UniProtKB/Swiss-Prot annotation:
Changing residue 133 to A: Displays decreased enzymatic activity on PET bottle and on BHET. It is found in: Secreted. This is Poly(ethylene terephthalate) hydrolase. Salts and glycerol enhance the enzymatic activity in vitro towards pNP-esters, while detergents and organic solvents reduce the enzymatic activity. Pathway: Xenobiotic degradation. One of its GO terms (molecular function) is acetylesterase activity.
Length: 265
């Protein structure tokens, strides 16, 4: 009955797998509008229009640090744009603007007959993700655009941890041993500041700052949680409610918190 539900009923194994049900292709954005560079990942056989997610790297970093999310999310039925920023040294506010410019360009390409994503995107259903500075940028994007349907930043950092205005469903990945953006001064104060939204905090046991980046050894769990979150909140897909809201029975999680996630009659 859900017009946004795509794909077969999920299982833990199907969400832990390297690839979801849909075939993925990608292209690099040929004239980036308001950001440095971009790659668009998209499903070729999703069976209806899908939401779009824009993902931003951290300071000094480029698409290669966040690139694993592209096929992982697109293969479950999302259009995903990974960007390079105008400068590798851009700050979170600028990263947010560039993230939203990337979503804008995905909307443009959805209306561009030569684009592979022509007519594939539901431009009313968008999400934001990132790493560190780009994670802070994702939270800024959510604060400034409450019609975004989900946010899932990783190891976030901003100069202000107070994101009390965010009403967007927000999953925060964190890394237990992060020495760049320590959990106790960054990710956790950010999480604690949000009292208005569905939210979740997932800390990877023993993880360094890069514990959710490309090449991490926890792609089964992190990918399951990221996809489940985006499915539940971008698609309103309650087949994913358990996976989205559950505390993982995993030694790969050192700290789990969630609020306002489960539905109550
Ligand atoms: Cl670290
Ligand atoms: Na450019």
């Amino acid at each position: 009955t859900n017009p946004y539900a795509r794909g077969p009923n999920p299982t833990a194994a199907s969400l832990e797998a390297s690839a979801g049900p849909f075939t993925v292709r990608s292209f690099t954005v040929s004239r980036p509008s308001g950001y440095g560079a971009g790659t668009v990942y998209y499903p070729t056989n999703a069976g209806g229009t899908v939401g779009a997610i824009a993902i931003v790297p951290g300071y000094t970093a480029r698409q290669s640090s966040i690139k694993w999310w592209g096929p992982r999310l697109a293969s479950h039925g999302f259009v995903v744009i990974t960007i390079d920023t105008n400068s590798t040294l851009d700050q979170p506010s600028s990263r947010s603007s560039q993230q939203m410019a990337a979503l804008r360009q995905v909307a443009s390409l959805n209306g561009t007959s030569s684009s592979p994503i022509y007519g594939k995107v539901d431009t009313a259903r968008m999400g934001v993700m990132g790493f560190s500075m780009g994670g802070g940028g994702s939270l800024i994007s959510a604060a400034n655009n409450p019609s975004l349907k989900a946010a899932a930043p990783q190891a976030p950092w901003d100069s202000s941890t107070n994101f009390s205005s965010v009403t967007v469903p927000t999953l925060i990945f964190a890394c237990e041993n992060d020495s760049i953006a320590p959990v106790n001064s960054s990710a956790l104060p950010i999480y604690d500041s949000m009292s208005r939204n569905a939210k979740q905090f997932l800390e990877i046991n023993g993880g360094s700052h890069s514990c959710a980046n490309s090449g991490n050894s926890n792609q089964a769990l992190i990918g399951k949680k990221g996809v489940a979150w985006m499915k539940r909140f971008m698609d309103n897909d309650t087949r994913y409610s358990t996976f989205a809201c559950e505390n993982p029975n995993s030694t790969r999680v050192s700290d789990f918190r969630t609020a306002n996630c489960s539905h109550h009659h």
